[PDB]
Design a protein around this nucleic acid. Structure first.
Length: 95
DNA sequence: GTAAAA
C-alpha cells in the first residue's frame, strides 16, 4: 500500500544529482503550479511561464533547504516568475 | 532568489 515515497525524499535525490526524481516531482506539481500562474498570464503563454519556474527551481533546488516546505517554496517561485514575465511584455511597447 | 498555505 501507499507510494512509500514522499515529496521530501524526491527533493533530496535531485540535490544528490538524480534529476530523475525532479522529473517525477515536476510533472506532479506541474498541475498545481500552473493553476497558480494561469491567474497572472493567459493560457496561451502559461505553460512557458511554468517551465521557466521549474528551470529556476532546479538551479535553486541545490540551494533549497529540504527542512522547509517544498510546495510553498515552489509556488512562490512560479508567481514571482509570473510578475517578471508581465514586465518582459510590459516593456513590449516601449522604446 | 524566491521559504505560511495553494
Amino acid at each position: 500500500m501507499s507510494e512509500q515515497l514522499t515529496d521530501q525524499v524526491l527533493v533530496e535525490r535531485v540535490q544528490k544529482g538524480d534529476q530523475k526524481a525532479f522529473n517525477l516531482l515536476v510533472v506532479r506539481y506541474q498541475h498545481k503550479v500552473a493553476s497558480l500562474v494561469s491567474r497572472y498570464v493567459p493560457s496561451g503563454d502559461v505553460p512557458d511561464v511554468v517551465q521557466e519556474a521549474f528551470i529556476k527551481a532546479y538551479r535553486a533546488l541545490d540551494s533549497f533547504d529540504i527542512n522547509r516546505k517544498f510546495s510553498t517554496w515552489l509556488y512562490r517561485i512560479a508567481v514571482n516568475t509570473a510578475k517578471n514575465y508581465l514586465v518582459a511584455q510590459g516593456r513590449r511597447l516601449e522604446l
